[PDB]
Amino acid sequence: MKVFGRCELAAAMKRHGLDNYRGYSLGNWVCAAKFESNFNTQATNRNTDGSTDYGILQINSRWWCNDGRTPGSRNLCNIPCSALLSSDITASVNCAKKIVSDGNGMNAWVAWRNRCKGTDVQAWIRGCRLQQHHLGGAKQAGDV
């Protein structure tokens, strides 16, 4: 039930405000969600903590949402966790733009600082507006 294809996602996240949210331009969010889930809106990871990592952007149940399973859940987003395991990424967005306003940005996503950070992440939104197929692709902020 909805594993995305790269520009479909990329553009959806353009449609919802991540394109340059607190410093991070689009290509950084297409690349964390790839290395976090492979654009699969239904992943679920348990950990030695007692939490699970849900949704597309792998948001954890210790801090963020609430499954009614993690002990000491803090549910900062005040969103049930399973509002995250669904096909429309409005919740997953509305929580991720809250993670990067509780620290120095995208270092909560362990996949992003490892496999995406220090790459030319712009290449993840190349070929794109939703795969257009003329050499590479689009434009969305900082024209110069």
Side-chain angles (χ1 to χ4, degrees):
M1 28 243 207
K2 209 144 193 170
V3 159
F4 287 61
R6 185 179 63 92
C7 308
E8 176 178 57
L9 172 78
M13 298 188 160
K14 255 236 63 44
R15 296 197 307 113
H16 281 112
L18 289 169
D19 188 40
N20 212 55
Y21 193 62
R22 281 196 164 50
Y24 315 106
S25 37
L26 269 191
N28 273 280
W29 303 89
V30 173
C31 188
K34 171 93 193 172
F35 283 122
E36 289 301 323
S37 73
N38 217 24
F39 324 117
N40 191 338
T41 64
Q42 308 296 312
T44 256
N45 248 296
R46 269 190 66 168
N47 333 98
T48 52
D49 275 337
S51 19
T52 305
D53 284 327
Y54 301 83
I56 191 171
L57 228 15
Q58 223 60 188
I59 295 184
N60 186 257
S61 58
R62 180 62 123 160
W63 318 109
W64 304 108
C65 56
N66 197 2
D67 41 25
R69 283 228 238 107
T70 305
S73 180
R74 269 279 277 197
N75 187 37
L76 288 221
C77 302
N78 238 336
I79 216 159
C81 285
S82 58
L84 306 179
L85 299 135
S86 133
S87 292
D88 189 287
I89 85 295
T90 301
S92 304
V93 144
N94 259 260
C95 194
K97 46 184 51 209
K98 189 152 319 181
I99 315 186
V100 303
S101 309
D102 164 73
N104 206 339
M106 273 187 83
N107 315 309
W109 297 283
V110 186
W112 176 80
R113 56 156 203 184
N114 287 1
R115 295 92 191 198
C116 309
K117 179 172 167 180
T119 249
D120 177 12
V121 285
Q122 278 185 214
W124 285 94
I125 63 91
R126 155 215 53 65
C128 287
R129 223 346 86 208
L130 201 331
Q131 307 88 303
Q132 38 52 336
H133 94 285
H134 322 145
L135 153 79
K139 46 65 207 126
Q140 268 308 254
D143 171 77
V144 61

Coordinates of all heavy atoms in Angstrom, one line a residue, residues 17-62:
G17 N 5.7 21.5 2.0 CA 6.5 22.4 2.9 C 7.9 21.9 3.3 O 8.7 22.6 4.0
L18 N 8.4 20.8 2.9 CA 9.7 20.3 3.4 C 10.7 21.0 2.5 O 11.9 21.1 2.9 CB 9.8 18.7 3.3 CG 9.0 18.0 4.3 CD1 8.9 16.6 4.1 CD2 9.6 18.4 5.7
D19 N 10.4 21.4 1.3 CA 11.4 22.1 0.4 C 11.9 23.4 1.0 O 11.5 24.6 0.6 CB 10.9 22.3 -1.0 CG 11.8 22.8 -2.0 OD1 13.0 22.4 -2.1 OD2 11.4 23.6 -2.8
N20 N 12.9 23.2 1.8 CA 13.7 24.2 2.5 C 13.3 24.6 3.9 O 13.4 25.7 4.4 CB 13.9 25.4 1.6 CG 15.2 26.0 1.9 OD1 16.3 25.4 1.7 ND2 15.3 27.3 2.2
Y21 N 12.7 23.6 4.6 CA 12.2 23.7 5.9 C 13.5 23.8 6.8 O 14.4 23.0 6.6 CB 11.5 22.5 6.3 CG 10.8 22.8 7.6 CD1 9.8 23.9 7.6 CD2 11.0 22.1 8.8 CE1 9.1 24.2 8.8 CE2 10.3 22.4 9.9 CZ 9.4 23.5 9.9 OH 8.6 23.7 11.0
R22 N 13.6 24.7 7.7 CA 14.8 24.9 8.5 C 16.2 24.6 8.0 O 17.2 24.5 8.7 CB 14.5 24.3 9.8 CG 13.6 25.2 10.6 CD 13.5 25.0 12.1 NE 12.9 26.1 12.9 CZ 11.8 26.8 12.6 NH1 10.9 26.6 11.6 NH2 11.4 27.7 13.4
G23 N 16.5 24.6 6.6 CA 17.8 24.6 6.1 C 18.0 23.6 4.9 O 18.8 23.7 4.1
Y24 N 17.1 22.6 5.1 CA 17.1 21.4 4.2 C 16.1 21.6 3.1 O 14.9 21.6 3.2 CB 16.6 20.1 4.9 CG 17.2 20.1 6.2 CD1 16.6 20.3 7.4 CD2 18.6 19.9 6.2 CE1 17.3 20.4 8.6 CE2 19.3 19.9 7.4 CZ 18.6 20.2 8.6 OH 19.4 20.3 9.7
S25 N 16.8 21.5 2.0 CA 16.3 21.5 0.7 C 15.8 20.1 0.4 O 16.4 19.2 0.9 CB 17.3 22.0 -0.2 OG 18.5 21.5 0.3
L26 N 14.8 20.0 -0.5 CA 14.2 18.7 -0.9 C 15.0 17.5 -0.9 O 14.6 16.5 -0.3 CB 13.5 18.7 -2.3 CG 12.1 19.0 -2.7 CD1 12.1 18.5 -4.0 CD2 11.1 18.3 -1.8
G27 N 16.1 17.4 -1.7 CA 16.9 16.3 -2.0 C 17.3 15.6 -0.7 O 17.6 14.4 -0.7
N28 N 17.3 16.3 0.5 CA 17.7 15.7 1.7 C 16.6 14.9 2.4 O 16.9 14.0 3.1 CB 18.1 16.8 2.7 CG 19.5 17.3 2.7 OD1 20.5 16.6 3.2 ND2 19.8 18.4 2.1
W29 N 15.4 15.2 2.1 CA 14.2 14.5 2.6 C 13.9 13.3 1.7 O 13.2 12.5 2.2 CB 13.1 15.4 2.6 CG 13.4 16.6 3.5 CD1 14.0 17.8 3.0 CD2 13.1 16.7 4.8 NE1 14.1 18.6 4.0 CE2 13.6 18.0 5.1 CE3 12.6 15.8 5.7 CZ2 13.5 18.4 6.4 CZ3 12.5 16.3 7.1 CH2 12.9 17.6 7.4
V30 N 14.2 13.3 0.4 CA 13.9 12.2 -0.5 C 14.8 11.1 -0.1 O 14.4 10.0 0.1 CB 14.0 12.6 -1.9 CG1 13.9 11.4 -2.9 CG2 12.9 13.6 -2.2
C31 N 16.1 11.5 0.2 CA 17.3 10.6 0.6 C 17.2 10.0 2.1 O 17.7 8.9 2.3 CB 18.5 11.5 0.3 SG 20.2 10.7 0.4
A32 N 16.7 10.7 3.1 CA 16.5 10.2 4.4 C 15.4 9.2 4.3 O 15.6 8.1 4.8 CB 16.0 11.2 5.4
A33 N 14.2 9.5 3.8 CA 13.1 8.5 3.6 C 13.5 7.3 2.8 O 13.1 6.2 3.1 CB 11.9 9.2 3.0
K34 N 14.3 7.4 1.7 CA 14.9 6.2 1.0 C 15.7 5.3 2.0 O 15.3 4.2 2.3 CB 15.8 6.7 -0.1 CG 16.7 5.6 -0.8 CD 16.0 5.0 -2.0 CE 16.9 3.7 -2.3 NZ 16.3 2.9 -3.4
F35 N 16.7 5.9 2.7 CA 17.6 5.1 3.5 C 16.9 4.7 4.9 O 17.3 3.8 5.5 CB 18.8 6.0 3.7 CG 19.7 5.9 2.4 CD1 20.0 7.0 1.6 CD2 20.2 4.7 1.9 CE1 20.8 6.9 0.5 CE2 21.0 4.6 0.8 CZ 21.3 5.7 0.1
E36 N 15.8 5.4 5.2 CA 14.9 5.1 6.3 C 13.9 4.0 5.9 O 13.5 3.3 6.9 CB 14.1 6.1 6.8 CG 14.8 7.2 7.6 CD 15.6 6.8 8.8 OE1 15.3 5.9 9.6 OE2 16.6 7.4 9.0
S37 N 13.3 3.9 4.7 CA 12.3 3.0 4.5 C 12.1 2.5 3.1 O 11.4 1.5 2.8 CB 10.9 3.6 4.9 OG 10.6 4.6 3.9
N38 N 12.8 3.2 2.1 CA 12.7 2.8 0.6 C 11.3 3.2 0.1 O 10.5 2.4 -0.5 CB 13.0 1.3 0.3 CG 13.8 1.1 -0.9 OD1 14.5 1.9 -1.4 ND2 13.7 -0.2 -1.5
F39 N 10.9 4.4 0.7 CA 9.7 5.1 0.4 C 8.5 4.2 0.7 O 7.4 4.4 0.2 CB 9.6 5.5 -1.0 CG 10.9 5.9 -1.7 CD1 11.4 5.2 -2.8 CD2 11.5 7.1 -1.3 CE1 12.5 5.6 -3.5 CE2 12.6 7.5 -2.0 CZ 13.1 6.8 -3.1
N40 N 8.6 3.3 1.7 CA 7.6 2.4 2.0 C 6.7 2.9 3.1 O 7.1 2.8 4.3 CB 8.3 1.1 2.3 CG 7.3 -0.1 2.4 OD1 6.1 0.1 2.6 ND2 7.8 -1.2 2.2
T41 N 5.6 3.5 2.9 CA 4.7 4.1 4.0 C 4.3 3.1 5.1 O 3.6 3.6 6.1 CB 3.5 4.7 3.3 OG1 2.7 3.7 2.7 CG2 3.9 5.7 2.3
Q42 N 4.7 1.9 5.1 CA 4.3 0.9 6.1 C 5.4 0.3 6.9 O 5.3 -0.8 7.5 CB 3.5 -0.2 5.4 CG 2.4 0.1 4.4 CD 1.2 0.8 5.1 OE1 0.7 0.4 6.1 NE2 0.7 1.8 4.4
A43 N 6.7 0.8 7.0 CA 7.7 0.1 7.8 C 7.4 0.3 9.2 O 6.4 1.0 9.6 CB 9.1 0.7 7.4
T44 N 8.2 -0.4 10.1 CA 7.8 -0.6 11.5 C 9.1 -1.3 11.9 O 9.5 -2.3 11.3 CB 6.6 -1.5 11.5 OG1 5.7 -0.5 11.8 CG2 6.4 -2.7 12.3
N45 N 9.8 -0.7 12.8 CA 11.1 -1.3 13.3 C 11.1 -1.5 14.8 O 11.0 -0.4 15.4 CB 12.3 -0.5 13.0 CG 13.3 -1.1 12.1 OD1 13.8 -2.2 12.2 ND2 13.3 -0.4 10.9
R46 N 11.2 -2.6 15.5 CA 11.3 -2.5 16.9 C 12.8 -2.4 17.3 O 13.7 -2.8 16.6 CB 10.6 -3.7 17.5 CG 9.1 -3.2 17.8 CD 8.2 -4.1 18.6 NE 8.6 -4.3 20.0 CZ 7.7 -4.9 20.9 NH1 6.5 -5.3 20.5 NH2 8.1 -5.3 22.1
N47 N 13.0 -1.9 18.6 CA 14.4 -1.6 19.1 C 14.5 -2.0 20.6 O 13.5 -2.1 21.3 CB 14.8 -0.1 19.2 CG 14.1 0.9 18.3 OD1 13.2 1.6 18.7 ND2 14.8 1.0 17.2
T48 N 15.7 -2.2 21.2 CA 15.9 -2.6 22.5 C 15.3 -1.7 23.6 O 15.2 -2.1 24.8 CB 17.4 -2.8 22.7 OG1 18.0 -1.6 22.2 CG2 18.0 -3.9 21.8
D49 N 15.1 -0.5 23.2 CA 14.3 0.5 23.9 C 12.9 0.1 24.4 O 12.5 0.5 25.4 CB 14.2 1.8 23.1 CG 15.3 2.9 23.0 OD1 16.1 3.0 23.9 OD2 15.2 3.7 22.1
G50 N 12.2 -0.7 23.6 CA 10.7 -0.8 23.9 C 9.9 0.0 22.9 O 8.7 -0.1 22.9
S51 N 10.5 0.9 22.2 CA 9.9 1.6 21.1 C 10.0 0.8 19.7 O 10.7 -0.2 19.6 CB 10.4 3.0 20.9 OG 11.7 3.2 21.5
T52 N 9.2 1.4 18.8 CA 9.2 1.0 17.4 C 9.5 2.3 16.6 O 9.3 3.4 17.1 CB 7.8 0.5 17.1 OG1 7.5 -0.5 18.1 CG2 7.7 -0.1 15.8
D53 N 10.0 2.2 15.4 CA 10.1 3.3 14.4 C 9.0 3.3 13.4 O 9.1 2.4 12.5 CB 11.4 3.1 13.8 CG 12.6 3.5 14.7 OD1 12.5 4.4 15.4 OD2 13.7 2.9 14.5
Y54 N 8.0 4.1 13.3 CA 7.0 4.0 12.3 C 7.0 4.9 11.1 O 7.7 5.9 11.1 CB 5.6 4.2 12.9 CG 5.2 3.3 14.0 CD1 5.6 3.6 15.3 CD2 4.4 2.2 13.8 CE1 5.3 2.8 16.3 CE2 4.1 1.4 14.8 CZ 4.5 1.7 16.1 OH 4.2 0.9 17.2
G55 N 6.2 4.5 10.1 CA 5.9 5.3 8.9 C 7.0 5.3 7.9 O 8.0 4.5 8.0
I56 N 6.9 6.3 7.0 CA 7.8 6.5 5.9 C 9.1 7.2 6.3 O 10.2 6.9 5.7 CB 7.0 7.3 4.9 CG1 7.7 7.4 3.6 CG2 6.5 8.7 5.4 CD1 7.0 7.9 2.4
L57 N 9.1 7.9 7.4 CA 10.2 8.7 7.8 C 10.7 8.2 9.1 O 11.5 8.9 9.8 CB 9.7 10.2 8.0 CG 10.4 11.3 7.3 CD1 11.5 11.0 6.3 CD2 9.3 12.2 6.8
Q58 N 10.4 6.9 9.3 CA 10.7 6.2 10.5 C 10.6 6.9 11.9 O 11.4 6.8 12.8 CB 12.1 5.7 10.2 CG 12.4 4.3 10.6 CD 11.6 3.2 10.0 OE1 11.7 2.1 10.4 NE2 10.7 3.3 9.0
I59 N 9.5 7.5 12.2 CA 9.4 8.2 13.5 C 9.1 7.4 14.7 O 8.1 6.7 14.9 CB 8.3 9.3 13.2 CG1 8.8 10.3 12.2 CG2 8.0 10.1 14.5 CD1 7.9 11.4 11.9
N60 N 10.0 7.4 15.6 CA 10.1 6.6 16.9 C 9.0 6.8 17.9 O 8.6 8.0 18.1 CB 11.5 6.8 17.5 CG 11.8 6.0 18.7 OD1 11.7 6.5 19.9 ND2 12.2 4.7 18.6
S61 N 8.5 5.8 18.7 CA 7.5 6.0 19.7 C 7.9 6.3 21.1 O 7.1 6.6 22.0 CB 6.7 4.7 19.6 OG 7.5 3.6 19.8
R62 N 9.2 6.5 21.4 CA 9.7 7.0 22.6 C 9.2 8.4 22.6 O 8.3 8.7 23.3 CB 11.2 6.8 22.7 CG 11.9 7.3 24.0 CD 11.5 6.5 25.2 NE 12.6 5.9 25.9 CZ 12.7 5.5 27.2 NH1 11.7 5.6 28.1 NH2 13.8 4.9 27.5

